[PDB]
């Protein structure tokens, strides 16, 4: 009877873990290996130091540290003293940092770069100063923490999500689908600002396994392959995009580990097929949900015969202490092939958003198995497989998943409207051969404005992953490309500033006048300035 | 032939307008002006110019847009014995100042007083002078000789002084063309160039009609409509514009009777396609600034007369052309030499007498001492004694026939505040040879005419890297966008480069390289 037990908090699990496996490797960065004994000592020293700087239970403390051993020492230490973490991406722009810390209400900010952070109602603290201040015997005096106490805050579009201790402490339970243990090794490549990073960190540190730390910045697919082999990773978690990258460029890497878990967004089955055919490793499709703290369900693709373009790959069956139900409009569990909405419950469920009205919209208390149980209501349209696996079939909300980052369109539209040259912007999602792309249609009165201007504008206000990749005829451009011969050097973009010489413009005007029954002079060409203006005057 | 001499341009025009008074001399838009009307306006304006104390030998510059009034002023200035300095109306005023200084101009007549610089010259409004024309005419114009100066042209600037004979020779019918008063000429060349003489004076000094193309850039379709509307029979084209007509509207080239292409080498394939397309005679011609105007014509009678350069032919009336070997003997057929030009068209010299001695040389030819302008064209004789140009040398650069000075553009580009240094070269292109960021062009456009600006301002790894990214871009070459932040694409690109080569390339290496070309540079460097 599961109601007779409850999870210990993350600090207590780590303390018992580090006593049961003290001589096991916990962290690897470059060639430096840190043991659980060594890591536990550093955690205890840093926790005492953090208490000296007036951090107490319940404080909202942000972390902005590059991927390094000190990042996880801070995570563990902040847990131990009962603070609430707000992880910030270290390459995030400081304007976005200001908005994040204000939405979270973070009163302290611990950073390895004090120059790259904004000022505000928070006290900024040097990571290096706090690490240097450690003493090698000081411990104790830490609060008793409950499983339901808050542990960290994550952001969704911004909405603040409050994660309980239990929501990540559940990753200290072995997952029967993975058969994971202390003998495994995890590669962390996900960013700490995302729930995905928990899958790598806490599944490692709370089972006695090893966590090998990828260097900061963008992933280097070949360095990651090199790193996976050198550090003998056995459990590999990947986003759909990065999984596709490995399949297309270095599929032989995907079978060095034992299990590969792809999660966060719909992936085309052919990529799974090539991966599954390519070797012995166990390939998984997983449901990950920020409001369920971390990875929630796994489906093991045993063979390519389970894959088809007729229907998407299942997300599988819940993790330990996770419960998932697909409900029809009458709050009945859907039968096989009946489409409904996916509800998630159990230990992983967040404590709620910062807005309690939105919390009531998305977190619902339902009597299930005869007991009042709280379900997070995902806006994912789903059904049950013939074998009671759960299959996601689509979406039904304004929150959209591009590259798995979960973006709200209206925020980027507004951020672009603040630019002096931009009058209004409309953003649309568009199909693309491999993954859907974000396409922004903008209107301006200024023509001396580059797409890079809008991109660099957003990059000071928002993360680089949030930028739309595309920003807002054929007969005219083809004619000019033949006149200058360089079909590829001259796009439909920009003015005619390369031009060539006089003769090129005369040739263009006469041929346009020949191909369109319209009188076009070089003066009309120079007054148009670009191909689009020529097309507009032609249709007029 | 030494017992008589050519009349001056005013006297030939007077004889023409007395013999053909009711013939159309000028056409602008729909406005037709007869020789009678043109003569009256010239006489009125000549009296006006004389009353303003312009006298024989005065250096008078004109900056007037293509219009009837432009040619009225040209004729009137000739009558009073002034020395013309035609200025391109699209020239920037800083270049206009340099031209007037090099010419020694004392006066400047313009239809736009605001577009010209001040200096040692008196500025006069064309329009005011036209209004000042009353009914009285002069009863005493200077006696002009064939050897009297008529106009000054520029080469790179050095001033070339043209005698009256040098353009008055165009009043003699050319036997190759069969021209007469019955013909019509399209004026489209700019007055700052000798080429415009071929159109202006061959019309006005033979009794023919001159149709005036509107100011600005040539509009190939507007020119086609105008050639058809005014039934042009003699069409003079630059090599570039001839090629443009052949490629776009070759049917226009056969509305006239003769088409004369001159100024630069033309691909024989263009002549062949032109000659096949209809009835008109296609000519290749030698034009030389120091010979005042068109100098020789070759009639390309069929496509069979062409092989993979077209001869420039035999001289015009009173022009003599000799190809000399190193010992000053006329070259035999197939013997290569240097082209020398003599006769009525030869210029009086440059403004500096040292260069005049360098390029104008007195040689005994068939027992007579004759003054030859010495070109730097390497040439030989055809088996039928047509002259064929085969190459070029020295400081003359043949970019679309403009005779560019490379050192001058280097200097003008070094003047920009972001100096650095410049080299500039000429490169072989499919079309005309090209001279090899827009701020630099807009800088030069303030110092020189737009035709003077260079058009370009600056191993399988490049092909491989381009195709590697084409796995993404097929959904452009080595510098269209440079570092264009879509993670996935940049990660895929760096890994595939590392996979297709044998070197560790990170996304940081891609971002620090900047583009496929710099990526290939580092790749070839790191190999």
Residue A210, SS3? strand
Helix ranges, A437-501 (H): 451-461, 474-483
Interatomic CA distance for residues A110 and A59, integer angstroms: 13
Backbone angles phi, psi at A425, to 5 degrees: -140, 140
Residue B371, SS3? strand
Q: Which two tokens stand for residue B425?
A: 């070269």
Q: Same structural domain for residues B347 and B490?
A: no
Pick from B270, B229, B264, B510: which is nearest to B403 by CA? B264
Packing angle of the helix pair B239-249, B268-276 (nearest 10 deg): 50
DSSP string, B289-303: GGGSSEEEEEEE--G
CB A270 within 8 A of CB A373: no
Q: Which two tokens stand for residue A197?
A: 């990073």
b/e per residue A102-132 (b: at least 16 CB within 10 A): eebebbbbbbbeeeebbeeebeebebeebbe
Q: Is residue A529 part of a domain?
A: no
Q: Is residue A495 part of a domain?
A: no
Is A222 in contact with B400 (Cβ distance < 8 A)? no
Q: Same structural domain for residues B48 and B194?
A: yes
**What is the DSSP code (8-state) at residue A8?**
P
* H/E stretch holding B338: strand B337-343
Residue of A nearest to B249 (CA): A510
Interatomic CA distance for residues A458 and B173, integer angstroms: 73
Q: Same structural domain for residues B93 and B179?
A: yes
At which of B331, B366, B389 does a domain end? Answer: B389
- Choose the closest CB to B221 out of A464, A491, A510: A510
CB A474 within 8 A of CB A443: no
Q: Is residue A381 part of a domain?
A: yes
Residue A208, SS3? coil
Q: Which residues of B touch A464 (CB under 8 A)?
A: 485, 487
Helix ranges, B377-486 (H): 406-414, 438-447, 460-473
* H/E stretch holding B130: helix B126-131
Q: Best mutation site among B190, B220, B237, B430 for testing chain A: the one with the most A CBs within 10 Å?
A: B220
Task: Identify the bridge partners of residue A442 per DSSP, sorted by sequence position.
Answer: A425
DSSP string, A118-174: --SSSEEEEHHHHHHT--TT---------TTSEEEEEEE--EEEEEEHHHHHGGGS-
The torsion angle over the Cα atoms of residues B511, B516, B521 and B523, rounded to 10 degrees, is 80
Q: Best mutation site among B243, B266, B431, B458 for testing chain A: the one with the most A CBs within 10 Å?
A: B431
Q: How far is CA B447 from the centre of its chain?
A: 19
Length of chain B: 527
Q: Same structural domain for residues B349 and B233?
A: yes
Radius of gyration for the alpha carbons in chain A, expressed in angstroms and rounded: 27
Q: Same structural domain for residues A391 and A414?
A: no
Q: Same structural domain for residues A40 and A112?
A: yes
CB A290 within 8 A of CB A161: yes
Q: Residue A264's CB: how many other CB atoms inside 10 A?
A: 26
Query: In angstroms, what separates the C-alpha of B450 from chain A's closest C-alpha?
Result: 9
The residue with tokens 């032609």 is A538
Q: Residue B51's CB: how many other CB atoms inside 10 A?
A: 13
Pick from A220, A234, A309: which is nearest to A267 by CA? A309
β pairing state of B281-287 and B83-86? unpaired
Q: Is residue A288 part of a domain?
A: yes
Q: Same structural domain for residues B214 and B76?
A: yes
At which of B373, B389, B405 does a domain end? Answer: B389
Q: Which residues of B touch A479 (CB under 8 A)?
A: none
At which of B334, B363, B389 does a domain end? Answer: B389
Interatomic CA distance for residues A7 and B101, integer angstroms: 96
CB A146 within 8 A of CB A155: no
- Choose the closest CB to B217 out of A222, A491, A522: A522
Length of chain A: 540
Q: Same structural domain for residues B372 and B508?
A: no
Question: What range defines the domain where residue A417 resides?
Answer: 409-471
Q: Same structural domain for residues A309 and A443?
A: no
* H/E stretch holding A229: helix A221-230
Pick from A463, A462, A464, A425: which is nearest to A442 by CA? A425
Is A491 in contact with B480 (Cβ distance < 8 A)? yes
After which residues is the backbone of chain B broken at C–N > 2.5 Å? 156, 308, 436, 458, 475, 484
Pick from B314, B349, B343: which is nearest to B166 by CA? B343
Resolution, given in Å to one decimal, reads 3.0
Q: Best mutation site among A239, A245, A506, A513 for testing chain B: the one with the most B CBs within 10 Å?
A: A506
Q: Is residue B174 part of a domain?
A: yes
Handedness of CA B116, B400, B479, A440 (dihedral sign): positive
The torsion angle over the Cα atoms of residues A20, A21, A26 and A30, rounded to 10 degrees, is 160
CB A66 within 8 A of CB A88: no
**How many domains, chain B?**
2
- Choose the closest CB to A489 out of B244, B477, B490: B477
Interatomic CA distance for residues B339 and B378, integer angstroms: 6
Query: Please, which residues have CB within 8 angstroms of residue B376's CB and are 6 or more apart in sequence?
Result: B338, B392, B393, B394, B395, B396
Task: Identify the bridge partners of residue A210 per DSSP, sorted by sequence position.
Answer: A185
Interatomic CA distance for residues A133 and A47, integer angstroms: 11
Within 13 Å, how many C-alpha atoms sit on residue B413's CB side? 21
Q: Which two tokens stand for residue A540?
A: 């007029």
Q: How far is CA B247 from the centre of its chain?
A: 20
Q: Is residue B303 part of a domain?
A: yes
**What is the DSSP code (8-state) at residue B278?**
S
Pick from A487, A496, A484: which is nearest to A524 by CA? A496
CB A183 within 8 A of CB A308: no
- Choose the closest CB to A488 out of B432, B477, B486: B477
After which residues is the backbone of chain A broken at C–N > 2.5 Å? 157, 472
Q: Which two tokens stand for residue B204?
A: 């006005």
Q: Same structural domain for residues B362 and B482?
A: no
Pick from B80, B82, B57: which is nearest to B142 by CA? B80
Within 13 Å, how many C-alpha atoms sit on residue A511's CB side? 19
Within 13 Å, how many C-alpha atoms sit on residue B114's CB side? 0
- Choose the closest CB to A513 out of B221, B475, B480: B221
β pairing state of B234-238 and B209-212? unpaired
Secondary structure string (H, E, C) spanning A251-320: HHHHHCCCEEEEECCCCCHHHHHHHHHCCCCEEEEEEECHHHCCEEEEEEECCHHHCECCECCCCEEECC
CB A231 within 8 A of CB A210: yes
CB B515 within 8 A of CB B482: yes
Residue A495, SS3? coil
Q: Same structural domain for residues B377 and B469?
A: no
* H/E stretch holding A17: helix A10-20
CB B500 within 8 A of CB A253: no
Interatomic CA distance for residues B400 and B240, integer angstroms: 7
**How many cross-chain Cβ pairs, A to B, lie less than 8 Å apart?**
123
Backbone angles phi, psi at B440, to 5 degrees: -65, -40
Q: Which residues of B touch A485 (CB under 8 A)?
A: 430
Q: Is residue A326 part of a domain?
A: yes
C-alpha dist (Å) from residue A97 to A68, A118, A406, B164, B397: 20, 7, 18, 81, 61
Pick from B376, B401, B374, B392: which is nearest to B239 by CA? B401
Helix ranges, B1-58 (H): 9-19, 35-51
b/e per residue B262-278 (b: at least 16 CB within 10 A): bbbbbbbebbbbbbeee
Residue of A nearest to B216 (CA): A523
Packing angle of the helix pair B239-249, B220-229 (nearest 10 deg): 80
Q: Same structural domain for residues A145 and A220?
A: yes
Residue of B nearest to A494 (CA): B480
Q: Give the CATH number of the domain where residue A415 resides.
A: 3.30.300.30
Instruction: Based on DSSP, count helices (H) and strands (E) in chain B, helices before strands.
Output: 17, 23
Task: Identify the bridge partners of residue B297 per DSSP, sorted by sequence position.
Answer: B285, B314
Q: Give the CATH number of the domain where residue A330 resides.
A: 3.40.50.12780
- Choose the closest CB to A249 out of B241, B487, B495: B495
DSSP string, A380-444: EEEEE-TTS-EEEEEE-SS-B-STTS-B-HHHHHHHHHTSTTEEEEEEEEE--SSS-EEEEEEEE
Q: Best mutation site among B495, B497, B515, B516 for testing chain A: the one with the most A CBs within 10 Å?
A: B495
Q: Which residues of A touch B248 (CB under 8 A)?
A: 507, 510-511, 514
CB B8 within 8 A of CB B168: yes
Residue of A nearest to B489 (CA): A245
Query: In angstroms, what separates the C-alpha of A538 from chain B's closest C-alpha?
Result: 17
Q: How far is CA B486 from the centre of its chain?
A: 51
C-alpha dist (Å) from residue B85 to B113, B162, B345, B359, B451: 16, 10, 18, 22, 19
Q: Residue A536's CB: how many other CB atoms inside 10 A?
A: 12
SS3 content of chain B, % helix, strand, coil (to 5): 35, 25, 40
Interatomic CA distance for residues A374 and A348, integer angstroms: 11
- Choose the closest CB to B507 out of A218, A464, A514: A218
SS3 content of chain A, % helix, strand, coil (to 5): 35, 25, 40
Q: Which residues of A touch B430 (CB under 8 A)?
A: 485
Packing angle of the helix pair B460-473, B516-526 (nearest 10 deg): 130
Interatomic CA distance for residues B203 and B171, integer angstroms: 8
Is B219 in contact with A506 (Cβ distance < 8 A)? yes
Residue of A nearest to B449 (CA): A502
Pick from B209, B229, B46, B208: which is nearest to B133 by CA? B46
Pick from A96, A261, A273: which is nearest to A178 by CA? A261
Q: Is residue A458 part of a domain?
A: yes
Interatomic CA distance for residues B114 and B117, integer angstroms: 8
Interatomic CA distance for residues A531 and A319, integer angstroms: 57
The residue with tokens 């005493």 is B140
From the number of C-beta atoms within 10 Å of its C-beta (0-12, 13-18, 19+), residue A406 rates as middle
Query: In angstroms, what separates the C-alpha of A438 from chain B's closest C-alpha?
Result: 11
Residue of A nearest to B483 (CA): A452
b/e per residue B468-485 (b: at least 16 CB within 10 A): bbeebeeebebebeeebb
From the number of C-beta atoms within 10 Å of its C-beta (0-12, 13-18, 19+), residue A257 rates as buried
């Amino acid at each position: 009877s599961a109601y007779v037990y409850q999870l210990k908090a993350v600090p207590d699990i780590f303390d018992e873990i580090s006593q049961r496996f003290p001589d096991r490797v916990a962290l690897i960065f470059d060639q430096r290996k840190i043991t659980y004994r060594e890591l536990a000592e550093q955690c205890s020293a840093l926790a005492a130091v953090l208490q000296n700087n007036c951090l107490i239970k319940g404080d909202i403390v942000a972390i902005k540290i590059e991927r390094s051993p000190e990042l996880y020492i801070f995570m563990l230490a902040l847990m131990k003293i009962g603070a609430v973490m707000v992880p910030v991406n270290s390459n995030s722009p400081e304007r976005y940092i200001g908005e994040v810390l204000s939405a979270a209400g973070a009163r302290y900010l611990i950073s390895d770069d004090v120059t790259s952070v904004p000022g505000g109602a928070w006290h900024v603290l040097s990571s290096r100063t706090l690490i240097q201040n450690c003493t090698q015997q000081r411990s104790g005096n830490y609060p008793v923490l409950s499983a339901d106490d808050p542990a960290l805050i994550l952001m969704t579009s911004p909405k603040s999500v409050l994660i309980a201790h239990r929501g990540i402490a559940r990753l200290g339970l072995p997952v029967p689908a993975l058969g994971n243990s202390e003998r495994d090794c995890y590669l962390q490549i996900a960013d700490i600002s995302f729930a995905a990073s928990a899958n790598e960190i806490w599944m490692a540190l709370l089972t006695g396994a090893c966590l090998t730390i990828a260097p900061p910045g963008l992933p280097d697919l070949m360095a990651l392959a090199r790193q996976i082999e050198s550090d003998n990773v056995t459990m590999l978690f990947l986003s759909g995009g990065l999984f596709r990258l490995f399949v297309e460029v270095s599929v032989e890497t995907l079978h060095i580990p034992d299990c590969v878990v792809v999660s966060g967004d719909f992936v085309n089955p052919r990529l799974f097929s090539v991966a599954v055919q390519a070797g012995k490793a166990k390939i998984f499709n997983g449901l990950g949900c920020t409001e369920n703290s971390a990875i929630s369900s796994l489906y093991h693709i045993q063979s390519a015969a389970a894959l088809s373009s007729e229907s998407p790959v299942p997300v599988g069956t819940p993790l330990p202490l996770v419960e998932m139900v697909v409900f029809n409009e009458r709050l009945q569990p859907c039968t096989c092939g009946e489409y409904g909405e996916l509800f998630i419950a159990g230990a992983g469920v967040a404590l709620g958003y910062s807005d309690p009205q939105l919390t009531a919209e998305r977190f619902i208390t339902i009597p299930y198995q005869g007991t009042d149980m709280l379900f997070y209501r995902t806006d994912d349209r789903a059904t049950y497989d013939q074998d009671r696996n759960i299959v996601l079939v689509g979406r039904g909300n304004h929150i959209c998943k591009i590259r798995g980052f979960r973006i709200n369109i209206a925020g980027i539209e507004h951020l672009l409207r603040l630019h002096h040259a931009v009058e209004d912007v409309l953003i649309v999602v568009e199909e693309t051969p491999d993954e859907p792309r974000l396409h922004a249609c903008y209107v301006t009165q200024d023509d001396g404005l580059s797409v890079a201007d809008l991109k660099n504008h957003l990059a000071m206000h928002a993360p680089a992953w949030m930028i739309p990749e595309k920003f807002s005829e054929q007969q005219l451009l083809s004619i000019w490309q033949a006149i200058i011969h360089s079909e590829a050097i001259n796009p439909q973009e920009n003015l005619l500033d390369q031009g060539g010489n006089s003769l090129h413009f005369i040739k263009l005007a006469s041929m346009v006048s020949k191909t369109f029954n319209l009188a076009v002079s070089p003066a009309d060409i120079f007054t148009a300035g670009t191909i689009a203006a020529l097309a507009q005057t032609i249709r007029q």
